Amino acid sequence: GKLDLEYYRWPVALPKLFFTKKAYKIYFIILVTGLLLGIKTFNDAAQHRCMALVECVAFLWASEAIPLHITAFLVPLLVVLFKVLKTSDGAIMSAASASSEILAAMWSSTIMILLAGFTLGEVLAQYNIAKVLASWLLAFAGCKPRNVLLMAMCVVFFLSMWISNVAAPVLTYSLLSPLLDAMDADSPFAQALVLGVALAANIGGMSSPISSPQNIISMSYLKPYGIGWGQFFAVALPSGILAMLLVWILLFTTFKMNKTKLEKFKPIKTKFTVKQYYIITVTVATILLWCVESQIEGAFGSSGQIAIIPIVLFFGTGLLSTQDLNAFPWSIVILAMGGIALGKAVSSSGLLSTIAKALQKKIENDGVFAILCIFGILMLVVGTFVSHTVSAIIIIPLVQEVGDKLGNPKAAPILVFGCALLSSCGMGLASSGFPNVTAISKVDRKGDRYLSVMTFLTRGVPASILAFLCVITLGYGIMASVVKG
Amino acid sequence: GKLDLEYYRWPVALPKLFFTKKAYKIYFIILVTGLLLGIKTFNDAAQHRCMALVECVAFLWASEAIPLHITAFLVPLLVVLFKVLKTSDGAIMSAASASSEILAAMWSSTIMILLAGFTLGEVLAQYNIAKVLASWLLAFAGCKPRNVLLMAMCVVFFLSMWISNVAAPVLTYSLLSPLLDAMDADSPFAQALVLGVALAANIGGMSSPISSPQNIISMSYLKPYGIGWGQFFAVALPSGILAMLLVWILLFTTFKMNKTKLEKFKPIKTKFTVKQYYIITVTVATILLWCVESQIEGAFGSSGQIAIIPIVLFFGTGLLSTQDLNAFPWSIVILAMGGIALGKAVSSSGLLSTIAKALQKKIENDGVFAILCIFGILMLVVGTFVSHTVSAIIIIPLVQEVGDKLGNPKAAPILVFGCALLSSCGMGLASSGFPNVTAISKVDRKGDRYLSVMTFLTRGVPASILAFLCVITLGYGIMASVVKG
Numbered sequence: 001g002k003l004d005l006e007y008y009r010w011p012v013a014l015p016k017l018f019f020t021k022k023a024y025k026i027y028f029i030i031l032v033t034g035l036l037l038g039i040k041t042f043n044d045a046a047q048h049r050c051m052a053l054v055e056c057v058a059f060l061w062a063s064e065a066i067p068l069h070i071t072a073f074l075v076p077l078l079v080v081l082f083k084v085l086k087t088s089d090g091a092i093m094s095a096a097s098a099s100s101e102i103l104a105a106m107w108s109s110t111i112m113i114l115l116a117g118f119t120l121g122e123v124l125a126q127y128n129i130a131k132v133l134a135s136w137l138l139a140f141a142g143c144k145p146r147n148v149l150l151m152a153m154c155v156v157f158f159l160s161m162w163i164s165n166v167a168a169p170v171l172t173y174s175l176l177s178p179l180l181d182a183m184d185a186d187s188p189f190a191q192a193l194v195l196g197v198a199l200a201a202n203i204g205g206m207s208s209p210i211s212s213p214q215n216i217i218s219m220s221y222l223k224p225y226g227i228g229w230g231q232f233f234a235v236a237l238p239s240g241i242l243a244m245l246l247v248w249i250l251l252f253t254t255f256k257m258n259k260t261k262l263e264k265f266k267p268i269k270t271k272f273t274v275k276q277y278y279i280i281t282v283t284v285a286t287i288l289l290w291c292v293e294s295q296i297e298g299a300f301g302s303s304g305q306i307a308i309i310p311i312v313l314f315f316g317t318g319l320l321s322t323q324d325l326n327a328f329p330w331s332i333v334i335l336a337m338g339g340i341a342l343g344k345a346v347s348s349s350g351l352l353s354t355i356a357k358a359l360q361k362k363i364e365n366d367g368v369f370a371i372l373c374i375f376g377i378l379m380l381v382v383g384t385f386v387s388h389t390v391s392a393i394i395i396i397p398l399v400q401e402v403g404d405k406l407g408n409p410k411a412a413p414i415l416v417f418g419c420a421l422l423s424s425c426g427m428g429l430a431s432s433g434f435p436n437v438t439a440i441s442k443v444d445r446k447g448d449r450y451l452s453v454m455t456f457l458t459r460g461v462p463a464s465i466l467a468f469l470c471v472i473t474l475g476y477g478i479m480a481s482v483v484k485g
Numbered sequence: 486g487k488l489d490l491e492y493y494r495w496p497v498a499l500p501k502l503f504f505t506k507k508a509y510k511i512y513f514i515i516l517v518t519g520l521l522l523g524i525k526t527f528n529d530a531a532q533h534r535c536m537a538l539v540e541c542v543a544f545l546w547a548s549e550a551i552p553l554h555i556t557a558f559l560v561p562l563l564v565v566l567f568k569v570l571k572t573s574d575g576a577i578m579s580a581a582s583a584s585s586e587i588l589a590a591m592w593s594s595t596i597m598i599l600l601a602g603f604t605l606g607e608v609l610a611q612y613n614i615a616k617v618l619a620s621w622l623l624a625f626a627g628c629k630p631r632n633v634l635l636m637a638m639c640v641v642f643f644l645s646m647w648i649s650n651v652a653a654p655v656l657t658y659s660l661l662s663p664l665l666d667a668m669d670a671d672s673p674f675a676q677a678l679v680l681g682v683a684l685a686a687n688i689g690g691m692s693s694p695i696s697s698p699q700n701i702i703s704m705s706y707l708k709p710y711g712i713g714w715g716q717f718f719a720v721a722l723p724s725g726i727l728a729m730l731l732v733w734i735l736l737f738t739t740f741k742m743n744k745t746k747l748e749k750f751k752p753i754k755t756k757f758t759v760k761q762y763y764i765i766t767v768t769v770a771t772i773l774l775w776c777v778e779s780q781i782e783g784a785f786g787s788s789g790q791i792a793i794i795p796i797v798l799f800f801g802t803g804l805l806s807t808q809d810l811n812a813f814p815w816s817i818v819i820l821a822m823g824g825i826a827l828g829k830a831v832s833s834s835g836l837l838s839t840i841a842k843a844l845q846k847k848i849e850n851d852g853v854f855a856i857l858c859i860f861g862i863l864m865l866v867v868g869t870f871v872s873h874t875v876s877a878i879i880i881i882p883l884v885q886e887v888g889d890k891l892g893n894p895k896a897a898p899i900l901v902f903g904c905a906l907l908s909s910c911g912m913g914l915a916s917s918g919f920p921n922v923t924a925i926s927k928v929d930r931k932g933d934r935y936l937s938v939m940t941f942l943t944r945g946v947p948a949s950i951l952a953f954l955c956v957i958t959l960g961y962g963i964m965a966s967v968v969k970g
């Protein structure tokens with residue numbers, strides 16, 4: 001509310017907001033975006049402008065020159081200013097059509113799932129269910145910080161296996177509240193816990209055939225090859241478990257959390273009440289409906305429609321108030337919507353399809369292992385900046401054609417399965433993916449964020465190579481026998 | 486956070502939440518919805534189910550059995566459960582397609598405009614611009630509460646004339662903060678001010694050719710008849726002014742606001758600073774870009790894209806924090822999204838078109854005045870429950886065909902103009918329309934809402950008849966000469 005500004009005076013009078021590090025970052029970003037737009041890169045004008053748009057948004061997010069959710073607000077404006085969206089015929093949309101098309105894509109089923117996760121976390125924490133459940137988990141984990149970390153990653157991984165990683169990190173953070181609440185933002189162990197839940201949700205989003213949209217989509221292509229739930233699990237669960245264990249070792253090695261004193265946790269043995277039993281029943285029913293979504297999709301259509309049921313049943317019954325809904329992390333929602341809009345712009349432009357078909361023209365005729373590693377590297381570099389769902393939708397159909405032409409009869413299922421698993425390894429950027437967006441916005445009791453974008457870059461990029469070597473070594477070894485062709 | 490419930494005991498043990506008035510309202514609503522679904526009403530099954538859906542949502546909103554923003558969350562779920570959405574060929578959408586199509590309609594351009602209005606109000610109130618401007622307006626208004634009311638309605642009406650009533654009520658409430666802040670929720674004058682700003686924004690949404698989407702759409706049809714900006718103003722501005730004056734008389738007559746003591750307001754004559762000048766410049770530029778949106782639509786596409794500019798320029802420069810964005814009235818946003826979803830369901834099912842074509846087959850061959858009054862009554866009963874934009878989009882094309890077949894050569898322009906003006910008169914329900922949704926959510930310093938849905942029904946329904954008699958008497962009299970044919 002201060003109405004005063006600082007000036008550099010005669011050195012005739014320019015304010016000091018034009019000479020800060022944020023101003024320098026913005027100058028550099030504008031410079032690079034203008035250079036990309038001016039210099040001819042892609043033959044297609046929409047793809048040429050979408051390359052500049054992707055670079056601009058990615059640099060703005062990585063440098064964090066402005067708040068991450070504000071770049072998310074800025075994405076739709078640039079999608080209309082940079083005429084990147086195209087119609088089905090392939091012509092550039094008019095600005096009005098592009099605006100209506102880009103504002104529609106932000107609100108989606110996963111926004112509903114995230115809001116339901118917020119509702120469930122608040123209702124479990126407010127009525128002492130999460131506190132009771134966190135006394136049995138923390139009793140099993142013990143008094144070693146690395147073991148509590150392992151328990152938290154295992155819990156979020158198992159949750160993401162069945163209900164996906166849109167809402168699993170929120171629920172795990174809600175169960176972690178009895179421990180995270182009394183931890184300052186500069187505590188190494190608290191940072192390790194938040195980052196570990198984020199990374200383990202990212203890894204768990206690739207294990208079960210229903211753990212992510214890119215897994216259901218991949219199974220749609222994989223089914224004709226005879227791959228079922230058991231074959232998918234035998235390959236994707238060991239890979240995810242090994243990747244999660246390696247990331248856990250990285251986390252308790254790179255963080256100075258091992259020398260910490262943890263409160264001894266004796267499990268709470270109180271009896272739940274009728275209100276608490278109602279909350280537990282609604283939570284369990286919502287989780288179960290999220291697990292069997294494909295068998296009730298003819299009525300509900302999506303998990304975002306199922307996500308409404310807890311919201312209505314907890315807010316409509318007075319268990320949660322209007323102030324509780326206004327206290328939701330809406331910056332997380334805005335950041336997620338911005339990520340979705342950027343992915344939709346990339347898909348509509350055709351930018352990623354051209355990159356993927358240019359890669360396809362070179363690495364083809366190569367062996368199945370090499371086409372797997374090169375494409376996995378591609379979706380590891382694209383997936384950390386673009387949504388994994390969009391990247392999988394574009395690439396999984398192409399690797400199928402690449403493998404359908406090879407002499408190996410097991411080549412196509414192996415490539416589709418591998419690219420499905422490797423489509424979730426990009427986790428280095430804190431402003432891409434629901435688990436990452438949730439963890440970057442977590443704040444302590446005083447309001448300071450536990451994690452910066454730099455910590456996410458320094459750990460989640462090594463945690464992306466770790467989750468990528470576990471798929472092309474263990475996962476490929478399991479596919480070599482499991483996949484029959 | 487209380488884990489205990491009350492029971493009726495042996496009268497063997499049923500809790501007391503099943504015998505409250507809210508439970509009775511819900512029982513009645515389920516009863517009526519099931520009776521509507523069971524009894525055959527409309528030949529089209531989707532329209533027959535949409536009638537029950539509209540009745541259910543309207544009754545839930547009017548009775549306030551559950552919070553209004555929670556019925557807004559419930560609307561998309563019922564749009565999928567009640568299979569009311571249809572494809573372009575007229576076949577019922579699959580639940581997945583219906584879910585993806587109904588969640589895409591919640592986030593729109595007007596949501597962005599409302600968020601920008603929140604941003605502008607917070608940035609003007611936080612940096613003392615609004616308190617400076619409210620010292621010159623309240624000096625002109627004087628020390629009579631009815632005159633302050635007149636000034637507030639005039640300000641919001643003039644704002645809605647140029648930038649529409651999506652953000653004008655928010656800006657007017659921000660300007661009224663120096664007066665509304667120190668007023669408790671049970672004060673008659675505060676309730677009169679909030680309701681008056683709501684009602685005057687509703688009336689102002691019909692005056693200028695760019696005051697509402699149903700005015701731009703109507704001008705699109707009116708242009709071939711020779712009607713221009715001057716002809717539109719000569720008819721719509723006197724009608725709006727008279728309706729606003731009659732509503733102001735209703736407000737200072739039905740509220741015990743006339744016996745009140747108001748603080749003497751001396752104009753604040755301080756000089757703005759560079760930061761305040763930057764805020765003023767950005768606000769004025771955003772308003773001006775909203776006024777000339779049709780001349781810059783080839784670049785921006787919508788006013789919701791223009792609405793992003795203040796958000797980025799105020800949040801990205803640090804003038805507003807993340808906590809300021811989390812303190813936004815998000816229940817208003819959810820309620821608006823629910824209204825939009827209900828309107829889209831009504832449009833897709835074809836329910837409103839069938840009612841409007843059933844009316845058209847009866848009232849046709851009558852005089853131009855009678856077809857005007859009957860259709861205006863229809864859009865006054867539909868517009869208070871369904872969005873005015875959807876109702877206008879459905880009906881304005883039909884009254885054109887009704888008038889194009891009459892013997893009067895001025896019949897079609899008169900009917901299109903009248904139905905454009907009468908499409909904004911429905912203002913009786915507090916959960917329909919941006920000005921109404923904004924006013925029903927306003928809270929005092931202690932958190933108590935100024936207005937209930939009952940107050941909105943008791944004053945805005947007589948304020949809807951008042952705004953409807955002003956169009957068919959003054960407006961029609963002006964059209965009788967202004968319209969040439």
Ligand SMILES: CCCCCCCCCCCCCCCCCC(=O)OC[C@H](COP(=O)(O)O)OC(=O)CCCCCCCCCCCCCCCCC
Binds near residue numbers: 029033038083798
């Ligand atoms: C309104 C005040 C600021 C509001 C908030 C600030 C951020 C949003 C507004 C500014 C964004 C850039 C608008 C101007 C360029 C749009 C692109 C365009 O016209 O089409 C491409 C443009 C024209 O394509 P057209 O759409 O076919 O006309 O490409 C070209 O062929 C010409 C490019 C020449 C170089 C122009 C210099 C632009 C530098 C990059 C600026 C990006 C900054 C993003 C924000 C970062 C900091 C926050």
Ligand SMILES: CCCCCCCCCCCCCCCCCC(=O)OC[C@H](COP(=O)(O)O)OC(=O)CCCCCCCCCCCCCCCCC
Binds near residue numbers: 043354
């Ligand atoms: C002055 C510019 C340099 C400034 C320094 C920083 C700029 C950051 C670089 C970001 C990418 C922009 C440069 C790439 C342009 C290549 C276009 C080209 O040669 O096309 C010819 C060539 C022919 O045009 P066509 O007829 O459209 O096929 O295009 C291709 O076939 C594709 C070439 C490969 C393009 C790779 C682009 C990057 C992929 C990853 C995207 C997602 C990550 C975004 C963040 C980047 C950082 C990791």
Ligand SMILES: CCCCCCCCCCCCCCCCCC(=O)OC[C@H](COP(=O)(O)O)OC(=O)CCCCCCCCCCCCCCCCC
Binds near residue numbers: 299
């Ligand atoms: C206690 C906590 C709250 C949670 C409780 C919710 C439990 C109920 C949800 C599961 C029921 C769904 C079973 C039907 C799904 C299969 C559809 C199918 O096979 O499609 C064929 C069929 C058409 O064939 P298709 O086009 O090939 O799918 O699909 C339909 O037409 C869908 C049938 C609509 C059924 C209406 C009821 C939906 C569930 C009620 C909504 C929630 C209110 C619950 C109130 C209490 C009731 C217990």
Ligand SMILES: CCCCCCCCCCCCCCCCCC(=O)OC[C@H](COP(=O)(O)O)OC(=O)CCCCCCCCCCCCCCCCC
Binds near residue numbers: 313502507
């Ligand atoms: C076959 C005959 C069916 C009869 C009609 C259906 C009856 C069951 C559904 C409607 C229940 C309405 C009465 C209870 C809710 C009103 C009170 C309230 O919300 O506050 C409670 C109350 C606060 O209000 P207070 O006690 O009045 O202060 O909150 C609680 O104590 C916790 C809530 C406990 C359970 C309430 C909801 C139970 C129903 C959920 C099951 C599925 C509902 C499906 C709805 C559509 C059905 C087609």
Ligand SMILES: CCCCCCCCCCCCCCCCCC(=O)OC[C@H](COP(=O)(O)O)OC(=O)CCCCCCCCCCCCCCCCC
Binds near residue numbers: 518
């Ligand atoms: C899951 C637990 C509760 C969650 C939150 C509570 C509110 C949402 C869930 C309940 C909403 C109603 C679901 C069951 C009926 C759906 C309609 C349907 O199946 O299609 C029409 C249904 C079937 O059409 P179909 O879609 O072609 O199968 O219409 C008919 O022809 C049969 C109608 C017979 C009467 C059924 C009784 C329903 C009573 C109305 C309930 C509405 C209550 C709304 C909530 C108010 C309180 C909050």
Ligand SMILES: CCCCCCCCCCCCCCCCCC(=O)OC[C@H](COP(=O)(O)O)OC(=O)CCCCCCCCCCCCCCCCC
Binds near residue numbers: 528539839867
């Ligand atoms: C047991 C039911 C009574 C329970 C008591 C409370 C019910 C509240 C009434 C809400 C409306 C539902 C009843 C109307 C059904 C008429 C259908 C009919 O006769 O069609 C035959 C008839 C022939 O079917 P067709 O082949 O589809 O044309 O339909 C028509 O031509 C249209 C008939 C006029 C329908 C008027 C419906 C109401 C218009 C306003 C909608 C927006 C406001 C929503 C809130 C209402 C309160 C103001």
Ligand SMILES: CCCCCCCCCCCCCCCCCC(=O)OC[C@H](COP(=O)(O)O)OC(=O)CCCCCCCCCCCCCCCCC
Binds near residue numbers: 081094782
């Ligand atoms: C200080 C507070 C901030 C506000 C300042 C913003 C002021 C600038 C906005 C107004 C400029 C728009 C003029 C062009 C609109 C007419 C388009 C037309 O005739 O369509 C034909 C033409 C195509 O014909 P059509 O398909 O029939 O429309 O439309 C276009 O291609 C659109 C041209 C794109 C121009 C790129 C620049 C857009 C404005 C820059 C975005 C904001 C960043 C400002 C940075 C500082 C620069 C001052």
Ligand SMILES: CCCCCCCCCCCCCCCCCC(=O)OC[C@H](COP(=O)(O)O)OC(=O)CCCCCCCCCCCCCCCCC
Binds near residue numbers: 005018022026030798
């Ligand atoms: C032709 C050559 C063009 C050169 C490149 C364009 C330069 C102008 C646009 C970029 C300005 C970047 C430096 C200033 C902003 C960083 C500091 C900040 O946000 O905090 C300020 C500062 C807080 O940060 P602190 O002072 O560092 O603590 O807040 C203020 O004092 C109020 C903000 C005053 C005005 C700042 C924004 C002015 C630019 C708006 C005009 C349109 C922008 C269009 C962007 C895209 C262009 C293509």
Ligand code: NA
Binds near residue numbers: 205206421
């Ligand atoms: Na995956």
Ligand code: NA
Binds near residue numbers: 383427428436
């Ligand atoms: Na990422």
Ligand code: NA
Binds near residue numbers: 690697700906907
């Ligand atoms: Na109107």
Ligand code: NA
Binds near residue numbers: 913914915917
């Ligand atoms: Na209304």
